[PDB]
């Protein structure tokens, strides 16, 4: 009865949700037909019909019909309500102005009409799970259009975002520094907590930790699905120490500007390394604070953790949890901020993370999703401003954006706001006087 609907914007948002909703059907025994052979645990993400057919609380939206028609013809064709699978005709096409003004304004009333039909049959609606990216025009433009609208119609709901942050050296599009600054100026006053995820840092984990020389986006979407299945584990399943979506934004957002933590999942092993280590709760907790296992390309040793959130699940004993965390406050490489002596939120669930068939993770008995809000993400925004300040000084690509319904001065409005955001990590990351 703690329902929670999720929104999937852009190609990145839908392809993450293809692995998320595959994972949720395995966690609840749901067939791809929506049935289950032979427990009101589905209810947070699954609304049930009059028969035994459970349909998801998802809104898959993309301005191009390519990625949705693979969903409409895939294995989970019969699972999804066909009015939820919302398309356009032409994509936003790596253009924030097409995603927000030209193409996004067409079907923004169609998506909100489908959000409202889900929210009416949700008697206990907690919040939103917007899966998008910062690089694509749909994931940046249409999300920023949608987060304005949901903050008007709902406002008090806990709107969680799960962005794909663009990597420093890997960038599969040219104008990703434009789409990321323009989507962050908009969603800053509207989102409540946006969980950053990077592509290059999961390329490293799938190569090193999972031993795959050639990982796909299919492999990266399995790991991001295990993050969200660990965050929303306490709603779906009974745990020893539970946590709500309102509790993530409470324990991780000290200031309403700074709401950008970074997700870190552990253990990430293959079947050949399911043996050769026992994976206690202290073995996997030191995995999360290791800078190699984080999923955003930042050095957490170059910053200070403002707030961490260790989401244990599986065969996890709370005494050994205290044995694992108390060692980390003694270490110097994990350093906190001066105003925060209490920098942990712990959640224990009784369910182990399940294994998807064809998945590249091993069946473990316990896991942890560290959601650490840190000072070290300011180096990420300093890169992205420097990628923005090189391009905009020559006014490159601006005619693709002005010609779709945008003022040229609005780029200075987004850059001055980000420069105001960059000193916010500087103002908080320093220590107090007296």
């Amino acid at each position: 009865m703690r329902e929670c609907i999720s929104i999937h914007v852009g190609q990145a948002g839908v392809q993450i949700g293809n692995a998320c909703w595959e994972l949720y059907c395995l966690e609840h025994g749901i067939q791809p037909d929506g049935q289950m052979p032979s427990d009101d645990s589905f209810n947070t993400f699954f609304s049930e019909t009059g028969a035994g057919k459970h349909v998801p609380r998802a809104v898959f939206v993309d301005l191009e019909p390519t990625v949705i028609d693979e969903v409409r013809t895939g294995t989970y064709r019969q699972l999804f309500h066909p009015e939820q699978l919302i398309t356009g005709k032409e994509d936003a096409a790596n253009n924030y102005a097409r995603g927000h003004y030209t193409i996004g304004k067409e079907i923004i009333d169609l998506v909100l009409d489908r959000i409202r039909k889900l929210a009416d049959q949700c008697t206990g609606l907690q919040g939103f799970l917007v899966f998008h990216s910062f690089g694509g025009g749909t994931g940046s433009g249409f999300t920023s259009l949608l987060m304005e609208r949901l903050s008007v119609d709902y406002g008090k709901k806990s709107k969680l975002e799960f962005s794909i942050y663009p990597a420093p050296q890997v960038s599969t599009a040219v104008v990703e520094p434009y789409n990321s600054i323009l989507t962050t100026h908009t969603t800053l006053e509207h989102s409540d907590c946006a969980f950053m995820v990077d592509n290059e840092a999961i390329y490293d984990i799938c190569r090193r930790n999972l031993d795959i020389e050639r990982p796909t986006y299919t492999n990266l979407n399995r790991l991001i699905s295990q993050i969200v299945s660990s965050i929303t584990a306490s709603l779906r399943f009974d745990g020893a120490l539970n946590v709500d979506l309102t509790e993530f934004q409470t324990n991780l957002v000290p200031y309403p500007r700074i709401h950008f933590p970074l997700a870190t999942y552990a253990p990430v092993i293959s079947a050949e390394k399911a043996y050769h280590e026992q994976l206690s709760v202290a073995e996997i907790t030191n995995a999360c604070f290791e800078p190699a296992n984080q999923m955003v390309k930042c050095d957490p040793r170059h910053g200070k953790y403002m707030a961490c959130c260790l989401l244990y699940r599986g065969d996890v004993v709370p005494k050994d949890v205290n044995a694992a965390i108390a060692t980390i406050k003694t270490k110097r490489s994990i350093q906190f901020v001066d105003w925060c002596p209490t920098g942990f939120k712990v959640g224990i669930n009784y369910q182990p993370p399940t294994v998807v068939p064809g998945g590249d993770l091993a069946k473990v008995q316990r896991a942890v999703c560290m959601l650490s809000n840190t000072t070290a993400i300011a180096e990420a925004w300093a890169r992205l401003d420097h990628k923005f300040d090189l391009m905009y000084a020559k006014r490159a690509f601006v005619h693709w954006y002005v010609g779709e319904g945008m003022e040229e001065g609005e780029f200075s409005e987004a850059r001055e706001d980000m420069a105001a955001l960059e000193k916010d990590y500087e103002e908080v990351g320093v220590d107090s006087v007296e």
Binding site: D238, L241, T250, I325, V337
Partner: protein
């Protein structure tokens, strides 16, 4: 006669209390159904304090389960001893507290508090003579800290003469289970010094040490930590439920233990605590139960009593034991630890001796210590509060829910008032 309404707030209090009602059902011979199945009539002599008898000779607990998320209520009603509670008592929200004091005390909890008080008042009318209310919760959560301390403020207004003993899990010194738990604990101790007659400070770090060092459980779950609190919770109210050679109630353990109406922050303790192997290598004697309580490694709060002085000490005993052997040992710890007790209270031990031991034990104890060792419990939190508040971090989640910075200034001034008071009477002569 002297009924107690048990209130459970937060995920923590619902998980402690579900183990508490597992002990009370065992001590009174109550099945999962709710029907009496014991053999002695001493179990039914004071059955009324924690039970209302329904039709068909079924006893339902006088427990009120409060949460802001429905996840903990499903864990109770589908677990064992879940079909014994009344479904009217399960009062739960949908949104969750958000790990937030202000969303539990002002926004979502104030919407649900009238759904609880109408069940509190409905239970309190069926009581013949009301003893008082006990609340189990935490201080680092949002429902246990916001919604829980909202109920105490709305009951002490409606029941100012009753006793309000809280079993509040205090944030541990080493690990932080919540990023904003310095903010949530400080805004609750503001509400506990003004509205509770007594308050039992429990640390999760201390119960980790007791399950590891003393009980030799290398892997204790929460249900092993909850069994330690539940044996302590039933031990404070055991002379009220069973006959004894020197009885006490929740008022005798409040009159004798609270010399000043703010200084009512207690540290619990239990004895005996033996492993499965080391239980045949030890004799159950009153000198052994005495020396097990009064050390540092048996405190269920993670503060060393040697860094302070006991103002008042309650040692509630259970089992067929002799009073001279008790009175010798209570004197014995006052001679050898005469610096560890306060000077200007002579003979600062309250003794209660019940006649009924716990299930499977020959005799037992329960330590209730009112020391100045919990000034370190609040010197730590008010340091962690001031370090976070001086940069005003994590504040817009509480300011944005209808609060100002004055509430944080007054709650931190109220805590440093109480830190100075335990600093005063420790050095007062």
């Amino acid at each position: 006669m002297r009924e107690i309404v048990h209130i459970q707030a937060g995920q923590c209090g619902n998980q402690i209390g579900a183990k508490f009602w597992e002990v009370i059902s065992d001590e009174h011979g109550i099945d999962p159904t709710g029907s009496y199945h014991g053999d002695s009539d001493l179990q039914l002599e004071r059955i009324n304090v924690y039970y209302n008898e329904a039709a068909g000779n079924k006893y339902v607990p006088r427990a009120i389960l409060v949460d802001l998320e429905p996840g903990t209520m499903d864990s109770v009603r589908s677990g064992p001893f879940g079909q014994i509670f009344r479904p009217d008592n399960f009062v739960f929200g949908q949104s969750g507290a958000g790990n937030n004091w202000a969303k539990g005390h002002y926004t979502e909890g104030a919407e649900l508090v009238d759904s609880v008080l109408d069940v509190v008042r409905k239970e309190s009318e069926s009581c013949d003579c009301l003893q008082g209310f006990q609340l189990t919760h935490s201080l680092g959560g949002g429902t246990g800290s916001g919604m829980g301390t909202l109920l105490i403020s709305k009951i002490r207004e409606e029941y100012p003469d009753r006793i309000m003993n809280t079993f509040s899990v205090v944030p541990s010194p080493k690990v932080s289970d919540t990023v904003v738990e310095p903010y949530n604990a400080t805004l609750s101790v503001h509400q506990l010094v003004e509205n509770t007659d007594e308050t039992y400070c429990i640390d999760n770090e201390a119960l980790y040490d007791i399950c590891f060092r003393t009980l030799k459980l290398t892997t204790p779950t929460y249900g092993d930590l909850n069994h330690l609190v539940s044996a302590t919770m039933s031990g404070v109210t055991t002379c009220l439920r069973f006959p004894g050679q020197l009885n006490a109630d929740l008022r005798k353990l409040a009159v004798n233990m609270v010399p000043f109406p703010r200084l009512h922050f207690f540290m619990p303790g239990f004895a005996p605590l033996t492993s499965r192997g080391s239980q045949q290598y030890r004799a159950l004697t009153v000198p052994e139960l005495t020396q097990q309580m009064f050390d540092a490694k048996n405190m269920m709060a993670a503060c060393d009593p040697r860094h302070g002085r006991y103002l008042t000490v309650a040692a509630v005993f259970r089992g067929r034991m002799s009073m001279k052997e008790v009175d010798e040992q209570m004197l014995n710890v006052q001679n050898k630890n005469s610096s560890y007790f306060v000077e200007w209270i002579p003979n600062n031990v309250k003794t209660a001796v019940c006649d009924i031991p716990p299930r499977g034990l020959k005799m037992s104890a329960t330590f209730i210590g009112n020391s100045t060792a919990i000034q370190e419990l609040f010197k730590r939190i008010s340091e962690q509060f001031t370090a976070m508040f001086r940069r005003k971090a994590f504040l817009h989640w509480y300011t944005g829910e209808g609060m100002d910075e004055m509430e944080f200034t007054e709650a931190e001034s109220n805590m440093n008032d109480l830190v100075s008071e335990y600093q005063q009477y420790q050095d007062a002569t």
